[PDB]
Design a binder for this molecule. Structure first.
Ligand SMILES: CC(=O)N[C@@H]1[C@@H](O)[C@@H](O)[C@@H](CO)O[C@H]1O
Ligand SMILES: CC(=O)N[C@@H]1[C@@H](O)[C@@H](O)[C@@H](CO)O[C@H]1O
Ligand SMILES: CC(=O)N[C@@H]1[C@@H](O)[C@@H](O)[C@@H](CO)O[C@H]1O
Ligand SMILES: [Ca+2]
Ligand SMILES: [Ca+2]
Ligand SMILES: [Ca+2]
Ligand SMILES: [Ca+2]
Ligand SMILES: [Ca+2]
Ligand SMILES: [Ca+2]
Ligand SMILES: [Ca+2]
Ligand SMILES: [Ca+2]
Ligand SMILES: [Ca+2]
Ligand SMILES: [Cl-]
Ligand SMILES: [Cl-]
Lengths: 154, 154, 154
C-alpha cells in the first residue's frame, strides 16, 4: 500500500532530521561551544570587514559580538589574533552600532581607543573594531584585513 | 506519477543517508579519530559529573573511559586539564566501576589515591574520578566541576 | 491526502538537503577552509600510501596535492610532519604523476631527491612522495607510514 510506504518514509525522514541535529550538536561541541552559550568559530582567515560580513552570512551566522567579559574572552581565545567584531560607526562617526542593530553597550577599549585614526594610509578614519590579542579592543580601518570569527546562537 | 514520485523520494532519502554518513566520517576524521579506534572529544567546559554524563548521553557518546595506557594518554591529550572519567564508586564505596558497567581492568591512580576525602567541603566523600594533567587518576567529589570529555566507539 | 503528503515530503527532503549543505559549509570553515581555496584535513594518523588513498577516497576526497607554493604551504601547515602527497612514479620509474592523472607541473624537491633509494630495506625503491617538515619533498617507499592528509575541492 502506497500509504504504508509513505508513512515508513516519513519515519525515515524524521530519523534523518534527528541524526543531522545530532551531527550539528557534536560539531558545535567539538568546536568549543559551551552549554547555553553562543558558539564562536573561525577559519583563521584574515580579510576586510566586508568579506567577514559576507562569509558569516553565508554560514547563516553573524560577525562575532562580545556583550560581556565572558563572551569577550571566548572570542579572544577562538581568534587567537586580531579579529573584527560586528560593531561599527560607519554611518555616524563616534556612534558605534552592532551589525545586528543597537548602540554599543559593553566595550573593552584599549586606553586611548577609539581614536578614529586617519594616518593608516588606507583612506578614511577607523570605523571598525577589532579585539586584539590581549582581549582589548581597538578601532581600525574597515578596509584592513583581520581574522574572520562568526557567531551562532546559544 | 504518484508511484514514480514515491520511488524517487526513496532514492532521495537513501542518497541523503549516505551523504550524512559521509559527513559524520569526515567530521570524526577532522576530530582526530584514528582508524578502527575509539575517539575522545571535548568542548573544554568544566561541569559536575552529572552534567558530563547527560551531555555525552545527548551526543550519543559516553564519559571517557581509559581501558589502557594508550587511551589514557589520548584522553589527557584531548582534555589538557583535569577531566572526569566514566568510573565511579557510587554504587559501593571503595569499589570503582565503569559507568558502562563492570569492574576496572586498568587503573592509573595517583599515589595515595583513591582516598574518598571529605575535607573538600562539598559534602560527602569522593565517588568520581578525574584524570589529572599528567595522566594519573584522583578520586574527587562528583559535585566538583571538571572537563567534559566524551568517547565515541571505534 | 496522498498527494499533499508527497508534496510535503518533497519539501521536507529539500529542507534537509539545504541544512546538510549548510552543515558541510560550516564544517569546512571550522576546519580552516579558506574562501575559494581547496582544503586539506588530517586526523594525524600515519599509514602506508595505499591506506591513505583508500581513506581519502572513502571521504570523497583525494590524497593532498600541492600545485603551487601556497597550497604546498597549506598542506605543510595542516600536516605539521612528513605526509604523503598524491604523487608517485609507480607507473613509470622516474616519471612522477599525480594519482589524479598527469605529469607534475609543480615540484618542490629537497636537494638530491628524488633518488629511488633501495637502502630502506622495505623492498623496491621509492615510488611515493612525502612533504617533509620544511615543505620540501622526498621520495619514499609507498610501504612506509606517513601522515594521511586529504584534499577537498575549492
Ligand atoms: C593595531 C593598533 O593598535 N593600531 C592603532 C591604530 O588603530 C591607531 O589607534 C594608532 C594611533 O596612533 O595607534 C595604533 O596602535
Ligand atoms: C585535586 C586533588 O588532587 N585533590 C585531592 C583530593 O581528592 C584529596 O585526595 C585530598 C586528600 O588530602 O588531596 C587532594 O590533593
Ligand atoms: C626520510 C628521508 O629523508 N629518507 C631519505 C630516503 O628517501 C633516501 O633518499 C636516503 C638516501 O640515502 O636518504 C634518506 O634520508
Ligand atoms: Ca568615520
Ligand atoms: Ca570611527
Ligand atoms: Ca584606533
Ligand atoms: Ca533529484
Ligand atoms: Ca568513594
Ligand atoms: Ca582523592
Ligand atoms: Ca513538518
Ligand atoms: Ca621511484
Ligand atoms: Ca628519497
Ligand atoms: Cl562524590
Ligand atoms: Cl615504493
Amino acid at each position: 500500500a502506497i500509504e504504508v510506504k509513505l508513512a515508513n518514509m516519513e519515519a525515515e525522514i524524521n530519523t534523518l532530521k534527528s541524526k543531522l541535529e545530532l551531527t550539528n550538536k557534536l560539531h558545535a561541541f567539538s568546536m568549543g561551544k559551551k552549554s547555553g552559550k553562543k558558539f564562536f568559530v573561525t577559519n583563521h582567515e584574515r580579510m576586510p570587514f566586508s568579506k567577514v560580513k559576507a562569509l558569516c552570512s553565508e554560514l547563516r551566522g553573524t560577525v562575532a559580538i562580545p556583550r560581556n567579559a565572558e563572551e569577550n574572552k571566548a572570542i579572544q581565545e577562538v581568534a587567537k589574533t586580531s579579529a573584527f567584531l560586528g560593531i561599527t560607526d560607519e554611518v555616524t562617526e563616534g556612534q558605534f552600532m552592532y551589525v545586528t542593530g543597537g548602540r554599543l553597550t559593553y566595550s573593552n577599549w584599549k586606553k586611548d581607543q577609539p581614536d578614529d585614526w586617519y594616518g593608516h594610509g588606507l583612506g578614511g578614519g577607523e570605523d571598525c573594531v577589532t579585539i586584539v590579542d590581549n582581549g582589548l579592543w581597538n578601532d581600525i580601518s574597515c578596509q584592513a584585513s583581520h581574522t574572520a570569527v562568526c557567531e551562532f546562537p546559544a
